[model samples]
Target: DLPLDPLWEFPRDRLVLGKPLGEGCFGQVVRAEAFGMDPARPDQASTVAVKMLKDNASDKDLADLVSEMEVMKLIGRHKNIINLLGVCTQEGPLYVIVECAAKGNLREFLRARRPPGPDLSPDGPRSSEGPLSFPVLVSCAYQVARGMQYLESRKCIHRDLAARNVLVTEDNVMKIADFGLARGVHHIDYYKKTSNGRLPVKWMAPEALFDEVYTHQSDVWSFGILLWEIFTLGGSPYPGIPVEELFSLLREGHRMDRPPHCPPELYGLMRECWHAAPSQRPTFKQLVEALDKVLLAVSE
Candidate 1:
């Protein structure tokens, strides 16, 4: 009998099914076949995204790999976090199985479709005329923030929150996936010293860069950035801005202020997320409460 818990069904011995999905500095991800209803039935074959460290990774690399799995395992049950299917290690080639997101990630969606440039032309025709909508993105934001808010309540900081980490289904359901660089939310307060060649953590608070700490405040920064990305239907992270110049400007407190095609109110809310001080940033709880009101207003 197939296990109801997908995590227990990985074939520990081989690269059972491999389909390359994505790659980052960390490693490559593959859309793989893990435990589904049944392999014989196409509909039953459970598709999963498996991320594996490169073959040449060192022991410390493996430790980090294991650590990320531990974190996801401990907190994967949340509705917003990606479902952990299982891990494959029988042949010593480590792999993590996560539920496959058929529609792919926020970034991929953006690359495939371009949003209408930075102006709301009532006369201009809208691009990306599919399931993409303001309410959908807002709803996605709410779901993701709710997940973060829950984590914040438990004192966890999702250090690497970004559009790429968010997956939206065909039905437009949003799930916040990936927690590799996540750590204690408290550490962000101590994040003052900047690492010379930092990753694209530019969407962070000033205090976060200076100190290694990430509290609910830093997550708010991420939320703002993520909101901008979602609103523009997967526009570039800095929204047509280059990374180096973007970083230079951001160090002075400029964020993705107004997304090119986002609605005015949505754009305004994003700016609130980019407030100068982390303390000034709103909590996910606050965002959730405010959004409920906004949704009600939209209904009216």
Candidate 2:
């Protein structure tokens, strides 16, 4: 028997698959219209994202998807993290629906600030909207810090915290995508334990690079990289450095230079995150508080 509560389960037929959103190693996430999510009045349907496996998925594949769902249920909701909305698993093909972040990943949104990813891609903010300011960028970072704080409280280590790995909303709020879903992912692309899959080398902290150790502090290091991406408008970390080259450079006390537009204050925060000593890095709680103050300054 599955741990899914009756309240969370939706009859399979109530969901109509729409279009493909994104795909990962575990399976693909499709845009869906959910009709079974308990309508108090039932005026209209809701748009959702559904995570489903390939029809021929093996047992391990099934377990990975279920594992992701389990962790999400336990951790529950945070305004900036993707939350499980409903599930349809009684039949052969499993379906896990989450409140859709139609804006897609943060990287895509950031790119839109720069310039398509085509197909009415839900991965970006409206370019036609007003100016893209530091407020929006800083706010994105703060929302993420808030989400990460929640994940920390649940003792869930976010092994991957890079720019492209995060998602955003139609309303412009950023959200963390993977949890138990971290290990499995799309088009089959994702963080993949960094080294274990292919390692986003530039984003890896020293300890994570050396001993395959991942901790909250290591996660901070990656967040530092993400912040750089935000300021740079989705620029890649370590411009021309390859995986092996970046490794030695890190040991030799090398680090990325600040993005051109990144302010001194923000650059300093990124530096703190890159500290060789993990303990010296700030926790997500501290990050949220600091970012909150920063946001306050810019919001006006």
For TM-score, the strongest prediction is 2
TM-score of each: 0.76, 0.87
The sequence of per-residue lDDT tens digits that candidate 1 reaches over residues 1-300 is 222335444564433557687655455688766444334553455556887887678776667777777676766467776767677655457777777778877766655655445464455464434445556556777788887876776566777787778886666566777664434445333323234222355566656765656677887888887887776665645545555565577677665557566678777778888888777777788988877766666663
lDDT of 1: 0.67
Give the lDDT of residue 92 in candidate 1: 55
User: Per-residue lDDT tens digits of candidate 2, residues 1-300?
Assistant: 565578778777888899898666677889999774756744458899999898778888888888887887789888988889878878547888888887778876887777333444464567334346888889999998888889988888887688777887888888898755655211223233342233465676778777678888888998999889899887778887766677678889998897786789889899999998899999989999998999999877
The 10-residue segment of model 2 with minimum total lDDT is 184-193
Clashes of 1: 20
Q: How close to the true structure is residue 23 of candidate 1, measured as C-alpha lDDT? A: 59
> How accurate locally, in lDDT, is each candidate?
0.67, 0.79
lDDT of 2 at 200: 62
